[PDB]
Amino acid sequence: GFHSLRYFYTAWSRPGSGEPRFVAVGYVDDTQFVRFDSDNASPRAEPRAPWMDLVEQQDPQYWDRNTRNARDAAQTYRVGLDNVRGYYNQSEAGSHTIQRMYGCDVGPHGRLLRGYDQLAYDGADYIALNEDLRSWTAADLAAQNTRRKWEEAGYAERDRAYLEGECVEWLLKHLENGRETLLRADPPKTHITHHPISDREVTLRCWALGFYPEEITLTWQHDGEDQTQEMELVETRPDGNGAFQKWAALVVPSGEEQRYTCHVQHEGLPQPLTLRW
């Protein structure tokens, strides 16, 4: 199964809070390993995962080189805010946002499945690198200005050369260093809880805790019949320890609890689970 190295840039203006801010974070799969925050004095690229403590000795220039790259990005996208505002003729008293997401998916053979670079303005698609990694799709007339500038700059080929070369190499390097964290599939710990509401109704809540990676499926059934439409399913949420939690809950009539089952699929489970109260 594939792995992915992904980087996420946010530059935004915050009129009334001071100068624009830039935050750049990396992830391998669902685990964040690095951050850069322009609000720091002399901001540096900084490790956010324990296995990253080992890269200083393997790559003594890693932190200085990543600090330079992120500082350069911080300058580019914060100036970019003023550039794009000018394309739209937007006033500077408003808050605006540029986001960039780029990275690579690698398959089980160690080779690139796909690269991507996409940008958003005020939360909407703005410009994206096409799947051929030589050309750009521009969302509107303003983004066509950007597109022309990046075609003249030959930036797609610089993108392609990173996404196909360096991105893949580094994903492989991180998967090796962070093997114990990244290559785990930690199954959910599951249980059902029982919450009477009224005299004739009760809530059954099916819990999945401590699982990695994030992808999971929770379902309720009644007599083998899928309850998806009637259940309350919360969005998967981080537990703050590097894993995730989810639950699905259902209102059933008192006395009928034994008729319902919870079904859990997660890649760390040897087979899908069925739980009953």
């Binding site: 980087y7 690095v34 850069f36 080189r65 990543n66 790259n69």
Partner: peptide, 9 residues
């Protein structure tokens, strides 16, 4: 690494 080249929009 973070990509080492960035281009102004």
């Amino acid at each position: 690494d973070y990509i080492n080249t960035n281009v102004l929009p």
